[PDB]
Design a protein around this ligand. Structure first.
Ligand SMILES: Cc1cc2nc3c(=O)[nH]c(=O)nc-3n(C[C@H](O)[C@H](O)[C@H](O)COP(=O)(O)OP(=O)(O)OC[C@H]3O[C@@H](n4cnc5c(N)ncnc54)[C@H](O)[C@@H]3O)c2cc1C
Ligand SMILES: Cc1cc2nc3c(=O)[nH]c(=O)nc-3n(C[C@H](O)[C@H](O)[C@H](O)COP(=O)(O)OP(=O)(O)OC[C@H]3O[C@@H](n4cnc5c(N)ncnc54)[C@H](O)[C@@H]3O)c2cc1C
Lengths: 649, 649
């Protein structure tokens, strides 16, 4: 059988990177266990456009994140904040985990969230060199096609940014503390310099730009290949077809189609690991030094819980025999991001409209994204952190795509066809998403697609009999996600209306109408914000206001009608994390509290969600785990011209 | 490790009965492997009101079919016929399988379906004695509470059956051949005799009645207990706390929390089974004679496929190492039933509406069902079997319950609140549901909650360039589920229109109006049927009808709008079966075609779905399996006064 010093469970964004550099920088035997196998020869994965269904059979037309051959199908419990819906969120199953199946938008997350929401030792300056390593190993690219709509939008954001600065207000969504009075929006002059949202020093917290950075590389023939954690760190230059490491990496052994069951303990020391191989026969792996769990946000706590680490009372109740350490926090504090969708219609001469919307087609260097920004809090969000006026937090990720991004049922109901040549999509993604959830295993036997995953989003506040003033502080906290989602709509509404101006100024005979959610409803909202000011959101709870005006019943009704849209007209991001966070399940050194030699090194260990997509943070965490395990800053101090060399096969 | 003569996988509706009676009638070593455990001491299962959430924690308020601790979570692939939805369909996990978590409505299925849709040897007279055994072992009870609305609905149906008989027409939904000219509707006079839909000879194919039959028994203290496969056949009188048989049953061995991975073969002969226990350790069980799979419609074909039985090219493509027999049909032909919901509002004085709607509350003896019938084809359904006029087929199971049975998102859009005191639910369940789907494993390693389950329902027909005449027979077959669902609405509409009469005749000063779907639409539908006749469903494809009149575009429009309602205003049943049906994956003696000694004895073997709920048919199959294996009609001939004895613990 196999015996190792370090056993790593899960070859995701964290596991791949962790295994790679541990083998390089030590002479220990590194054993990496993965539930799936490599997909280096699969065009659905290695062609970036595979994400959009280029290679889908027309009879089984499903994305990788809908496909059990490519992923874990994590079906959550009924969402009490979304009509009982049960969304299915995926973890990639294969070399590289979810980076094997994601949309490849690589985003650091910015300085502020690490300086403020992570503990000492995990502040932005403690992690920035590792983020730099994660980026240069991928070496991501920018959009190869400039679209007129991008510049018109950027020019629209600039005008708004100037108004917000000129007004002198303390907090608003285009303000950026590190750039002062100069609107931090990329210019549209002919040879303008790009603004980099991943800038090394974290200056660009709030920033508007023309391009994200995509995880693809160009091959000699001009085609693009997916550049993910899988083929960057486990390609054939480093790991052969039998899974044995090569050369300086020969201590590494990578087991494919190996589904891990439990960590076996002696006292509070892990000494072995279970897994079922591709034939369905169970094997034992002996452990000499450490076990590192990197199985993703949904499934890392399930491994710990199946292993005897969690709420003893609960774990006993479903039949876990061998209990190890009692910590009720295992699996709690699950966070995510959330993207409510908006649709816009372009009016005007068909030829002028076709011109205005040109160059937006998805290709590998943009994956569909034509902008736009990382934005801050709306001035009227009552739930800002205390120091939001002295440091600039990230709140919204503003993305613009072509086409109609609402689900098919919403397309039917709204009358908005994906084949109209005059519609496009704006999304204000909440990346400081208030809701919190938890994960519990339902059975002790085997790893399952579906543990109990509780995650309630846009819940309602039920009024009590107490005086109103005693209720508002509780309601403000409960309604926190509805409030942020609706204000994101107002941000897009503002943007669209300046675009009406900057589009004419750029010579386009067009005008724009927000059509999803209803233009009529959004207008009323915008007006409501100006009429009722800081406390507009009280009308989510109409009975406690006692405004018996025709105008008051009407705004309360508008908020009611609008509360529908973030519930069904949205796409839950697949950015789940924090379910075993630092200070709750593991300590500052990623060691699982209560054990001698178990660590967690994936996104489940994260103290707080990064301000943006989550791939970069995941690989960053595994990267720091490399130096923590070796006891020297090998990875932090590695020069930036030293990268893994890509082998496509 | 263990050794047995017959190894049974899954203690479901079939597994429990098969294990019980095999132990009794033979001296063989019978080993029953079950993934879950007994819930004899869990009030959520053994108290029938637990199904409705009596013991649910208020913060995790979820039914058993939503709970991984009680069930497998079968999330299906996106439904191309329902806006991409992914409903999650459960199999119970524990002693009694799905009978442990279901709504307990015990229905045989009627004679016609077995006489016409099952193979030689499985005709009604071949199976009726086994059905009789299944019923007397449970001994279901009828509703303990007569409600006025039931009698009002029945008297309305009587009037409708009489019009249908009088008209001399060959096929309609209240006609029943075996009872001729006497309307087969239970009488509502004071001391009327009940109609039994499960009558032994199968006379009542189409029949209206006041009560279904529930799987509960009354205890001496007046409380009701759930009477399911688990505690009927595997309670402490028969199997001790260690899973070992008692007395005459000592050959039986029941292993709990045993998740089976594969069946091991030597040649085309099974010699073993592997399983994972609750500690996460794999065991091997030796097989001397036979292996019987009774793991449910979703998971029976997955065990075979993981074992090397199925489409070889595909099983290779996902990494199954050991192939055994090539049968591309394994897992194909999956069927289900489907229940679109209708909501009715009662108008009148609040006190008189309240009286009309009294006594409809769910209690253990009715589980909410207050009627009503098994109905036949609507006369304007073009997809009847050839002999639909010489034998009476079951097509709709018409059920009436209290409250508002549409999903929460639909309650909001329609304004139909579950707390309005004046709404009730009528359901015409398509129990000859046209759609056919299939199951394939996504990975070779382990049993999973979520294999690929493709099941597309209310798909659209896309017109080709061919002449209309060549397309209609295709369009007729494609649109079959939409056609039947809509006609189900009309059946309810007709009933409601007569109930307006019969409510006055019974002294209720109320009026009834169908409000979900919109009354206007159903009205327009009813007129459309009389106007365009047999070829009304052509207007699903308006461009092929070339009717550009206002009356024509309007009817085409009415149908487009109604197609929305069965897709989202409904509940997919958990009556899945036929995925390893007789004549395709197994032969008439339940043996897996291609093996020496493997059988399938659960609902996945079913040739065609029973005309009604599926528990009974499932146990019926397990029952013949007892006789088929032992080679004698032991069970067919056992006297009906010899029943299993109930032990509550
Ligand atoms: C559809 C989709 C779109 C996304 N879009 C983007 C994007 O555009 N940009 C971005 O920055 N991020 C995106 N992500 C998120 C990003 O990819 C993840 O956050 C990142 O992979 C998380 O890193 P991780 O190591 O913690 O998790 P994972 O990458 O998911 O690592 C999990 C690995 O562990 C394995 N594993 C799990 N359980 C077991 C077990 N019991 N035994 C053995 N192995 C196991 C899994 O097979 C998997 O390989 C998206 C993800 C998805 C699924
Ligand atoms: C929510 C719900 C409501 C329903 N309501 C009704 C109703 O009102 N009336 C009605 O007649 N029917 C209803 N049923 C459906 C009916 O109960 C099923 O069709 C019937 O029980 C089928 O039984 P079965 O033998 O085919 O398999 P099942 O009853 O489903 O049992 C299969 C068993 O095999 C086990 N198993 C699966 N895989 C493995 C493995 N790898 N290793 C070990 N064990 C395994 C499962 O745990 C399960 O215990 C309902 C079902 C559900 C879930």
């Amino acid at each position: 059988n196999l015996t190792g010093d370090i056993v790593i469970i899960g070859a995701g964004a964290a596991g791949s990177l962790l295994a790679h550099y541990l083998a390089r920088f030590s002479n220990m035997k590194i054993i990496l266990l993965e539930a799936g196998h490599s997909h280096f020869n699969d065009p659905v994965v290695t062609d970036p456009m595979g994400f959009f269904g280029k290679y889908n059979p027309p009879n089984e037309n499903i994305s990788m994140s809908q496909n059990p051959s490519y992923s874990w199908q994590g079906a959550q419990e009924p969402n009490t904040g979304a009509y009982g819906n049960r969304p299915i969120i995926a973890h990639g199953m294969g070399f590289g985990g979810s980076t094997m199946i994601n949309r490849l938008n690589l985003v650091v997350g910015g300085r502020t969230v690490f300086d403020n929401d992570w503990p000492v030792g995990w502040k932005y300056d403690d992690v920035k060199n590792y983020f730099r390593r994660v980026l240069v190993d991928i070496n991501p690219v920018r959009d190869n096609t400039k679209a007129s709509i991008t510049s018109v939008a950027l020019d629209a954001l600039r005008i708004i940014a100037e108004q917000q600065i000129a007004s002198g207000e303390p907090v608003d969504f285009l303000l950026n503390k590190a750039t002062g009075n100069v609107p931090n929006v990329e210019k549209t002059t002919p040879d303008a310099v790009p603004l980099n949202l991943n800038d090394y020093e974290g200056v660009n917290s709030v920033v508007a730009f023309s391009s994200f950075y995509m995880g693809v590389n160009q091959l000699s023939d001009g085609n693009y290949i997916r550049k993910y954690a899988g083929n960057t760190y486990l390609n054939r230059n480093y790991v052969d077809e039998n899974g044995r490491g090569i050369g300086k990496f020969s201590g590494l052994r990578v087991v494919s189609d190996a589904v891990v069951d439990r960590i076996i303990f002696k006292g509070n020391r892990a000494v072995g690991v279970n897994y079922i191989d591709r034939e369905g026969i169970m094997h034992y792996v002996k452990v000499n030094k450490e076990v590192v769990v990197t199985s993703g946000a949904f499934y890392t706590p399930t491994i710990l819980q199946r292993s005897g680490i969690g709420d003893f009372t609960y774990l006993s109740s479903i039949g876990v025999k061998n209990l190890v350490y009692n910590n009720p926090l295992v699996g709690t504090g699950l966070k995510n991001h959330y993207s409510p969708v908006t649709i816009t219609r372009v009016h005007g001469e068909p030829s002028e409209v076709s011109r205005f919307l040109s160059n937006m087609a998805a290709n590998p260097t943009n994956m569909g994204f034509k902008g736009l920004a990382e934005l801050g809090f709306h001035r009227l969000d009552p739930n800002k952190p205390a120091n939001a006026n002295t440091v600039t937090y990230r709140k919204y990720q503003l993305m613009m795509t072509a086409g109609v991004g609402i689900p098919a049922e919403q397309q039917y109901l709204s009358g908005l066809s994906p084949s109209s040549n005059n519609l496009f999509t704006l999304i204000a993604d909440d990346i400081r998403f208030a809701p919190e959830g938890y994960i519990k295993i339902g059975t002790p036997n085997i790893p399952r697609d579906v543990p109990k995953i509780f995650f309630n989003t846009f819940v309602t506040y039920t009024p009590t009999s107490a005086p109103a003033d005693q209720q508002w502080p509780i309601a403000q906290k409960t309604l926190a996600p509805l409030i942020s989602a609706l204000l994101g709509y107002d941000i897009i509404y503002q943007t669209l209306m300046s675009m009406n101006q900057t589009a004419r100024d750029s010579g386009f005979q067009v005008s724009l109408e927000m059509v999803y959610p209803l233009n009529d409803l959004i207008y009323k909202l915008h007006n409501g914000l100006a009429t009722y000011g800081a406390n507009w959101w009280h009308y989510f709870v109409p009975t406690l206001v006692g405004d018996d005006t025709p105008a008051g019943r009407e705004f309360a009704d508008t908020l009611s009608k609008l509360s529908y849209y973030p519930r069904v007209g949205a796409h839950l991001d697949s950015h789940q994390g924090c379910s075993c966070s630092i200070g709750r399940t593991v300590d500052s050194n990623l060691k699982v509290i209560g054990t001698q030699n178990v660590r967690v090194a994936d996104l489940s260990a994260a103290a707080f969600p990064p301000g943006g997509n989550t791939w970069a943070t995941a690989s960053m965490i595994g990267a720091r785990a490399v130096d923590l395990i070796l006891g020297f800053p090998y990875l932090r101090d590695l020069p930036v011209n030293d990268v893994p060399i890509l082998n496509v096969n």
